[PDB]
Amino acid sequence: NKCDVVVVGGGISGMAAAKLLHDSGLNVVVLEARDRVGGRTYTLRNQKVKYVDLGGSYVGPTQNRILRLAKELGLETYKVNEVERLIHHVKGKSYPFRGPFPPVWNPITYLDHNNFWRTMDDMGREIPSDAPWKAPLAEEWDNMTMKELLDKLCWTESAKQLATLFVNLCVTAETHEVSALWFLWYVKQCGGTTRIISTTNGGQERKFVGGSGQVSERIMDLLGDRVKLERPVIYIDQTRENVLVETLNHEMYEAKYVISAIPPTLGMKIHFNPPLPMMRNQMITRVPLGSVIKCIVYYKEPFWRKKDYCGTMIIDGEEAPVAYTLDDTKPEGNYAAIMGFILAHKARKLARLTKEERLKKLCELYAKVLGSLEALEPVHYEEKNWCEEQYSGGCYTTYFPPGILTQYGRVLRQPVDRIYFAGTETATHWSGYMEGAVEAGERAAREILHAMGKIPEDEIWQSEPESVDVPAQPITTTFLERHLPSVPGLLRLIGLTTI
Amino acid sequence: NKCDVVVVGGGISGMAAAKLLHDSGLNVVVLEARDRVGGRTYTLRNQKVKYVDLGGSYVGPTQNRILRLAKELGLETYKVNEVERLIHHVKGKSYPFRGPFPPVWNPITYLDHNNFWRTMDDMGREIPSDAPWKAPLAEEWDNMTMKELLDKLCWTESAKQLATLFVNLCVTAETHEVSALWFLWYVKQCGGTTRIISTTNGGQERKFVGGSGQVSERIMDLLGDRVKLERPVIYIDQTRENVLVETLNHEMYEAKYVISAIPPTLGMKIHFNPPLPMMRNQMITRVPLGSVIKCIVYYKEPFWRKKDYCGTMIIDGEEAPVAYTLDDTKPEGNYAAIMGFILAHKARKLARLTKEERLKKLCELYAKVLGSLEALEPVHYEEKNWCEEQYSGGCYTTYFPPGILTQYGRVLRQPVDRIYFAGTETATHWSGYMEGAVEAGERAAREILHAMGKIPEDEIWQSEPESVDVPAQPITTTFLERHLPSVPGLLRLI
Ligand SMILES: *Cc1cc2c(cc1C)nc1c(=O)[nH]c(=O)nc-1n2C[C@H](O)[C@H](O)[C@H](O)COP(=O)(O)OP(=O)(O)OC[C@H]1O[C@@H](n2cnc3c(N)ncnc32)[C@H](O)[C@@H]1O
Numbered sequence: 001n002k003c004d005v006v007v008v009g010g011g012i013s014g015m016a017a018a019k020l021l022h023d024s025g026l027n028v029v030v031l032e033a034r035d036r037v038g039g040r041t042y043t044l045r046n047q048k049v050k051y052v053d054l055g056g057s058y059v060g061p062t063q064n065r066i067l068r069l070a071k072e073l074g075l076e077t078y079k080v081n082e083v084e085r086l087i088h089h090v091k092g093k094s095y096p097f098r099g100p101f102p103p104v105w106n107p108i109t110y111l112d113h114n115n116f117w118r119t120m121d122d123m124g125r126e127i128p129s130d131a132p133w134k135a136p137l138a139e140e141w142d143n144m145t146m147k148e149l150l151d152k153l154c155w156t157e158s159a160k161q162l163a164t165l166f167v168n169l170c171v172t173a174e175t176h177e178v179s180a181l182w183f184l185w186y187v188k189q190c191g192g193t194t195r196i197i198s199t200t201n202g203g204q205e206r207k208f209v210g211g212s213g214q215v216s217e218r219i220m221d222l223l224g225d226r227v228k229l230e231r232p233v234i235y236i237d238q239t240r241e242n243v244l245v246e247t248l249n250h251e252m253y254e255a256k257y258v259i260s261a262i263p264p265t266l267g268m269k270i271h272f273n274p275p276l277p278m279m280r281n282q283m284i285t286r287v288p289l290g291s292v293i294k295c296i297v298y299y300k301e302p303f304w305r306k307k308d309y310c311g312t313m314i315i316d317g318e319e320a321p322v323a324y325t326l327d328d329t330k331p332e333g334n335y336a337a338i339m340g341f342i343l344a345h346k347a348r349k350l351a352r353l354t355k356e357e358r359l360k361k362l363c364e365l366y367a368k369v370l371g372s373l374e375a376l377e378p379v380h381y382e383e384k385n386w387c388e389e390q391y392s393g394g395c396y397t398t399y400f401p402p403g404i405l406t407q408y409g410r411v412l413r414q415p416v417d418r419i420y421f422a423g424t425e426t427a428t429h430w431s432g433y434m435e436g437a438v439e440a441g442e443r444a445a446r447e448i449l450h451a452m453g454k455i456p457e458d459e460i461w462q463s464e465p466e467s468v469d470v471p472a473q474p475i476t477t478t479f480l481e482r483h484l485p486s487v488p489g490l491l492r493l494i495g496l497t498t499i
Numbered sequence: 500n501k502c503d504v505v506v507v508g509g510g511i512s513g514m515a516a517a518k519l520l521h522d523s524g525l526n527v528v529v530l531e532a533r534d535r536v537g538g539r540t541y542t543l544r545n546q547k548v549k550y551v552d553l554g555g556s557y558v559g560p561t562q563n564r565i566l567r568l569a570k571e572l573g574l575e576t577y578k579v580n581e582v583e584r585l586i587h588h589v590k591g592k593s594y595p596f597r598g599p600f601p602p603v604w605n606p607i608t609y610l611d612h613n614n615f616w617r618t619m620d621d622m623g624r625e626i627p628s629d630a631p632w633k634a635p636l637a638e639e640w641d642n643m644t645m646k647e648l649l650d651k652l653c654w655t656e657s658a659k660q661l662a663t664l665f666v667n668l669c670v671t672a673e674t675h676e677v678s679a680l681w682f683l684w685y686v687k688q689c690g691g692t693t694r695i696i697s698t699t700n701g702g703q704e705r706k707f708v709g710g711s712g713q714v715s716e717r718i719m720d721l722l723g724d725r726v727k728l729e730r731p732v733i734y735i736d737q738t739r740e741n742v743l744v745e746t747l748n749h750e751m752y753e754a755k756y757v758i759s760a761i762p763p764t765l766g767m768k769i770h771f772n773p774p775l776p777m778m779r780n781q782m783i784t785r786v787p788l789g790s791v792i793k794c795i796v797y798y799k800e801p802f803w804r805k806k807d808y809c810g811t812m813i814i815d816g817e818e819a820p821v822a823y824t825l826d827d828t829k830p831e832g833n834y835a836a837i838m839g840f841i842l843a844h845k846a847r848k849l850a851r852l853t854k855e856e857r858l859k860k861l862c863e864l865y866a867k868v869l870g871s872l873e874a875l876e877p878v879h880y881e882e883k884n885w886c887e888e889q890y891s892g893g894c895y896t897t898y899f900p901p902g903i904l905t906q907y908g909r910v911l912r913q914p915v916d917r918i919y920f921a922g923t924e925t926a927t928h929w930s931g932y933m934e935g936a937v938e939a940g941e942r943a944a945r946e947i948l949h950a951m952g953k954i955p956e957d958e959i960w961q962s963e964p965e966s967v968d969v970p971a972q973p974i975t976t977t978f979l980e981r982h983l984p985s986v987p988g989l990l991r992l993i
Pocket residue numbers: 008009010011012013014031032033034036037038039040041054055056057058059231232233234261262263266269270292293294386391392394395396397422423424425432433434435437
């Protein structure tokens with residue numbers, strides 16, 4: 001019934017918010033729709049796998065908030081296997097490599113790839129993390145899709161195909177589905193292309209020992225009975241002195257303030273009194289989540305390592321069900337496994353199949369890419385299609401179609417009377433990730449602390465000390481990377497000389 | 500409590516479905532979220548206006564279902580005034596014209612405009628009304644926006660500005676927001692460019708005497724206490740023998756079947772048990788409605804008619820708050836008024852202003868376009884910003900961003916166990932309109948009658964006899980319109 005703050009949603013964002021508020025001495029309640037906490041994180045436990053992350057899993061350098069939160073809760077990380085060679089599989093053949101970017105030998109294609117990644121970051125530097133709609137060309141860039149941008153930028157099919165994979169993998173959406181402005185913002189707010197694509201020194205460096213679901217679970221243990229499971233929120237009434245929050249199972253909660261810690265569009269599942277202001281009313285119908293099936297195939301041994309492959313496969317084109325894999329073997333070397341994503345339209349297309357049919361297509365793919373008959377001998381399989389989740393809407397995160405971020409983006413974390421907005425979507429650093437969930441939950445909690453006169457305004461946004469356990473190597477470029485011409489740059493140089 | 504069919508939503512679609520089911524002898528209940536029926540139609544009555552449609556208003560030839568339903572309920576139509584000249588206002592000057600398409604005189608611009616309209620209809624001929632995702636180039640066209648298509652097709656800024664206005668006015672959305680496939684389908688399923696843009700012999704020919712809200716009101720009158728107002732549906736449970744439908748005010752309704760007659764995305768306001776299938780779960784997050792403020796400025800007299808202007812203004816460019824107007828005067832020449840739409844991004848931009856500030860901007864625009872100081876002397880004003888509506892999501896209808904129609908379009912009218920889907924968005928002819936609302940409501944009702952064994956499969960979709968009161972005249976083209984080259988066509992020859 002009565003409390004200081006109701007937090008709607010018990011994912012990492014809502015739990016981080018509730019914890020901060022609880023630690024500050026307030027009375028918080030967390031209302032969670034599901035029979036579990038963690039949301040878009042979910043750690044399955046059984047005897048065949050021990051534990052496995054079926055939702056969000058990876059953490060890495062520069063994600064200091066999630067690292068700090070997890071460390072405080074008694075959790076540890078380990079490094080995702082990247083000892084041996086990565087594979088880029090292109091036009092039916094595998095090309096092993098080292099370093100984060102799949103390399104290319106053809107001089108023209110080399111210039112085109114170099115320019116593609118460089119230009120993503122060049123454009124990113126024009127986009128403020130906390131206000132992407134303030135970019136000087138925000139309108140122009142928001143009114144084109146990523147498909148249009150790649151069609152203009154990539155002078156080779158090689159670069160276009162890799163760039164397309166990059167978009168699909170980063171945002172679980174097609175290049176023609178997403179705004180160029182929003183995509184460029186998304187990458188820049190993770191620290192740019194190198195940081196977002198890298199295992200070693202990037203976003204995919206590490207996993208939590210025992211699964212990421214422990215973050216939300218251990219906060220629930222700290223909060224005790226303040227977390228209410230199977231309480232989907234249906235109604236928020238701000239017409240009276242205290243806010244009234246009603247759940248589907250016929251309970252009413254009364255609070256001074258509310259934190260909405262659910263994906264933005266999932267706000268539609270709540271009926272509001274008074275109605276939401278116009279811009280938010282429409283925004284929450286314009287912001288879908290992407291589409292992904294996360295699939296883990298288990299093997300007797302991590303046999304790929306014996307061929308000097310680390311387990312990372314980057315697999316171009318249409319026929320492959322999975323475009324990206326990582327080694328998911330436990331740090332101890334057992335429960336050998338390959339994690340792969342079925343992305344964007346393929347998550348829709350292949351959902352028609354049975355679990356056994358998907359397993360077979362994945363093993364056949366892995367056998368070809370790894371040149372290994374052992375890939376046809378799985379011992380176990382787990383998967384999760386996040387498109388089917390009523391209380392997520394998709395994974396990893398919300399994407400913005402063309403035109404939406406400039407028209408509606410400014411209201412994403414704008415309070416609505418006594419409702420404040422958390423959720424990874426409202427973060428300014430690693431939005432879309434567990435890191436962003438912590439940033440947003442803690443920031444929303446401090447907004448309320450400020451509204452209550454407990455902290456000054458300059459304490460709402462708080463910097464985070466660098467992790468001593470996961471130091472961040474800087475992102476660097478070479479002279480040639482900075483100054484080599486694009487393909488059209490080279491052609492201009494050719495035209496000028498012959499004159 | 501217990502009934503045969505629960506209809507969620509008391510707009511035209513839900514009302515049409517409930518009426519059909521009721522007339523066949525089933526016990527129906529309509530659960531309506533608002534304190535009124537009509538949904539995206541809303542007729543306001545007061546002494547100053549008599550009545551005014553602040554939502555959907557226009558009907559025309561080929562919309563035989565809405566015309567038949569309205570006639571049965573005792574309604575009459577009158578013609579939107581198009582006796583005098585239309586105005587196209589371009590680069591600060593008014594150019595009066597007759598006929599539906601704003602004309603041009605420059606030979607290159609002429610070829611470009613001609614080709615633009617012709618191409619929209621050429622592309623439409625390959626898009627099945629009942630399955631646009633089966634177009635031969637469905638993927639190619641769905642993966643581009645209308646902005647990309649227009650940038651490719653229009654060699655002149657003149658044609659591109661008019662085409663942009665056309666898109667904005669048709670679908671209350673920006674060219675870059677919408678799938679080209681979806682937009683081309685939308686036009687084709689209203690009978691093509693001429694039919695969709697025309698007042699005389701098209702979609703804007705007529706209005707209902709006393710307002711379109713009377714359709715939904717008069718069905719509510721027939722149904723009596725079967726219509727439950729202020730019953731927003733929050734929960735649908737299909738796990739047991741009968742379907743259970745719960746409302747926000749705590750009531751529980753039990754039925755054999757349910758019709759969802761709400762905009763597709765407003766399905767998100769309902770919690771489902773079991774969860775919806777994957778494709779629908781995601782679809783209902785991918786389908787926004789457009790943005791519009793409908794504004795009606797009243798005057799002492801329809802003064803524009805004295806200058807041989809009918810009151811239609813087509814107003815290009817960014818600065819104008821309103822891109823399109825029609826004469827809203829009543830049939831007797833009284834309650835003189837101009838109806839104008841503030842479209843798409845301008846609805847968002849100008850919503851910050853006060854009502855009085857919007858009135859001043861509109862009057863000054865109209866004074867310029869009509870070339871009359873009389874436009875600065877309004878006697879009354881009414882407006883409605885549909886972007887504010889929790890239980891509509893916007894107006895006129897749902898648009899599909901790039902990539903969505905091909906991936907999720909099949910899902911829209913697919914039943915989910917014992918839930919069938921009505922709403923104008925599910926129609927195959929004049930989807931987006933009151934006509935499509937009737938088509939979809941009656942079809943969803945007949946799906947349930949078929950499920951019950953009461954009618955055969957072949958009676959689910961029913962043709963409609965042509966209205967005697969509003970007959971359609973054929974859409975024609977000239978030899979030169981059909982065969983003149985495009986701009987790049989003319990360049991190939993040179
Ligand atoms: C799904 C997924 C996500 C993911 C990823 C791979 C997959 C398959 N990989 C990631 C990774 O490797 N590293 C990483 O940092 N992130 C990764 N992601 C994304 C990550 O999981 C998310 O960014 C993050 O978990 C989101 O946290 P947040 O707290 O912002 O949101 P949530 O988890 O969705 O929590 C929302 C909770 O709210 C409940 N809910 C929903 N509606 C209601 C109502 N009406 N009432 C009450 N509760 C509600 C949800 O049930 C959920 O628990």
